[PDB]
Amino acid sequence: CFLVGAQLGTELFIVRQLLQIVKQKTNQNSVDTTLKFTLSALWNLTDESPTTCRHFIENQGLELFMRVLESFPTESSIQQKVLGLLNNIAEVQELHSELMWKDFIDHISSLLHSVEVEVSYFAAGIIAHLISRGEQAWTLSRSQRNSLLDDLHSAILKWPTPECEMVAYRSFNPFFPLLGCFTTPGVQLWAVWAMQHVCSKNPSRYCSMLIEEGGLQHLYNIKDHHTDPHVQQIAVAILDSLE
Amino acid sequence: CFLHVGAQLGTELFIVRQLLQIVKQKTNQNSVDTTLKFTLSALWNLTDESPTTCRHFIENQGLELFMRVLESFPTESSIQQKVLGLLNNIAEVQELHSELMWKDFIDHISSLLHSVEVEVSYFAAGIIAHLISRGEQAWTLSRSQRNSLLDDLHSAILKWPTPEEMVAYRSFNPFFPLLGCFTTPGVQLWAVWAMQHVCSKNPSRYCSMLIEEGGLQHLYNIKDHEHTDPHVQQIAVAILDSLE
């Protein structure tokens, strides 16, 4: 029992209502369980869902998430939930335009050099999906675009094995376009590191998934292509863990 | 990209918790605004076919809240509708039968059962229908109220006009147990009336669904059950001949 096709605007109402909970919490500098949950709620709702990403931007979720970063510069887990939702937005190619914003990129480049890999990993992701889209869709500066490409690659190699799995994925599909961005190794580097990371932490879930969705061929494509050593290194490791 | 595996369930129960807070606030302020009826819809939708969120509703005092809503806004029928329709979802969950046996609650439903708007009394009928269908042994409250309620159910349905669609369904399954309740014909009468309503205003979607889910069997079973309430039997053949 419910009221036909009336569930479409309840989830958009929900996004609107959680955003207000973020504002009222940021307003009060109240890093509490409720704020953390609301941030997690927003993250999961945007998962595999470009309509929710759009609603998040249509009500001013970027501006607000910016101001969230700024109000809680040392709260590692806050940042993570913020950047995680923002990684989902980085995935939607139509919304790429509305992330072309140096105040937003300046926040992401900052958190790329976090000593917490949990934080820096999601920053890296946002960067890789944005650099993935080529020089011609980067409406911002090319001194920053080239500089983040370098910082992204060098950052990944500073990363320890993390203790627990840091992220869940329902599908590996968004990674495949990054696997073929040979001109930008840091974008491929992030992709392979992450696949390796979830496949070593939770193979029972992710090896079957990676294989079924057609991942091996992309990985094999890297194995034989002049390619970046590090990217090729992680590449053959994942492969050999199955072949 | 999401937080962890299975995190989605934990954030659905949080949304229910937060939404109920917006209810509690708006009722505190005697405010009947857009957000409140949006919140009430959202809670209604979330309980559709989700025994789990329904149980979460109960465990976060949703019932006592919702009846504060009822007691604080007696004239706002569209509000009462959203409240009872959710409660109708809850009534559909057998493991929650104990929680709805609150005398203050049943007393209020029974009031709205006799409301003037079918858009409000329909859902109250649904709550009462589903409750009586679990039998005498399960009714832990006034055996007399239960026998009065069973007649009043039957009465208030027969006085109902044909609306201009109050409710939607994704399945007919929760009705089918009611179509068997021969000793309790009010229950049966609510089911076939409800079934007939949605089939008559949206046949393309509901008539098929009824058939796919094996509805005709239950209907034809009432047809050749020799000693069925004539009002129930009539609506049932009305439904059947609307396909046969």
Numbering used by the authors:
A (entry chain B): 479 to 481, 483 to 704, 706 to 723
B (entry chain A): 479 to 642, 644 to 723
Sentences from the paper on this structure:
To understand the molecular basis of ZER1/ZYG11B-mediated binding of non-Gly Nt-residue peptides, we determined the crystal structures of ZER1 bound to either SFLH-, AFLH- or TFLH-peptide, as well as the crystal structures of ZYG11B bound to either SFLH-, AFLH- or CFLH- peptide. Meanwhile, ZYG11B displayed appreciable binding to Nt-Ser (KD of 6.8), -Ala (KD of 7.1), or -Cys (KD of 3.0), albeit slightly weaker than Nt-Gly (KD of 2.5). Notably, ZER1 and ZYG11B also have the capacity to recognize the Nt-Cys, which is known to be only 50% Nt-acetylated by NatA in cells. GPS assays showed that in contrast to control GFP, the Cys-GFP fusion proteins are indeed efficiently degraded upon the overexpression of ZER1 or ZYG11B. Moreover, the Cys-GFP exhibited dramatic instability in response to NAA10 KD, whereas further double knock out of ZER1/ZYG11B was sufficient to restore Cys-GFP stability, establishing that the free Nt-Cys can be targeted by ZER1/ZYG11B for degradation. The free α-amino group of the Nt-residue forms hydrogen bonds with the side chains of Asp556 and Asn597 in ZER1 (the counterparts of Asp 526 and Asn 567 in ZYG11B), respectively. Furthermore, the carbonyl oxygen of the Nt-residue is stabilized by two hydrogen bonds from Asn597 and Trp552 in ZER1 (Asp 567 and Trp522 in ZYG11B). Likewise, consistent with the structural observations, the mutants W522A, D526A, N567A, E570A and N523A in ZYG11B were defective in binding to the XFLHVGQD (X = Ser, Ala or Cys) peptides.
